[PDB]
């Protein structure tokens with residue numbers, strides 16, 4: 097039923113430059129945290145202030161695009177959207193012309209996902225919701241590295257791989273049915289929080305199984321996404337060439353979990369929201385994460401900064 101893995105697309109790159117830990121300079125320079133501040137994996141849950149190749153500023157059009165995908169991610173937390181399959185929610189005006197093809201709410205791992213299509217913008221959308229109990233999800237997070245089965249020599253966190261696997265077979269079949277019908281359309285994947293992890297694994301699976309998808313027509317946007325796998329996994333993600341915009345809001349803790357020092361590493365160019373008034377996004381123009389954007393503020397992180405992106409509530413349908 098799933099199309100088979102394509103060998104040329106499931107090979108780890110032969111030799112990758114080593115990456116030094118991108119959080120270590122900040123972990124040494126910053127601190128100590130105030131005594132009363134709670135931590136998870138050494139990162140603050142509730143710090144309320146900042147501590148004492150290249151970077152650029154995102155343009156208005158780039159910020160509009162990141163905002164649109166944030167909106168899709170946010171609306172997925174609304175039960176009128178998943179499993180209701182309606183555009184009846186407060187930020188649903190921006191997505192109301194999209195046709196909802198299918199939604200899922202899986203049994204064991206509670207993966208909530210949807211496929212939609214926009215004929216005006218010639219795009220097939222895949223959206224993954226994060227946890228329905230975010231604070232408990234963050235507090236309860238483990239780090240259990242396991243083999244990433246498609247790509248030998250790579251590892252990912254088991255919970256993330258499990259979240260995707262439960263919805264994978266049906267969702268791939270729905271996406272590829274849409275892509276057969278609308279062959280010139282873009283495929284765009286998005287999610288916030290845990291949903292961003294799931295979205296990454298979904299984009300990789302579609303690249304690995306459908307020759308007709310590539311860097312030209314398969315795009316990934318995440319918000320508040322945790323690290324998903326080890327440096328060999330991140331180097332594999334880079335190798336795919338998939339366009340990958342990874343947005344981080346200010347001091348959001350979740351992009352810093354699990355910490356880099358625990359042997360995980362992000363791929364995907366970082367778009368760091370540094371200010372809402374005026375809206376400012378600092379882009380660290382590297383495919384592997386750097387010490388120059390949100391990694392510069394650890395461990396002075398925040399759960400509250402995870403719960404809104406671009407002034408849109410992310411994780412709460414309000």
Ligand SMILES: *[C@@H]1O[C@H](CO)[C@@H](O)[C@H](O)[C@H]1NC(C)=O
Nearest residue numbers: 130132133134141142143144
């Ligand atoms: C953080 O959480 C702890 C536990 O609830 C509390 O004792 C502390 O005042 C909080 N600190 C800040 C700066 O919010």
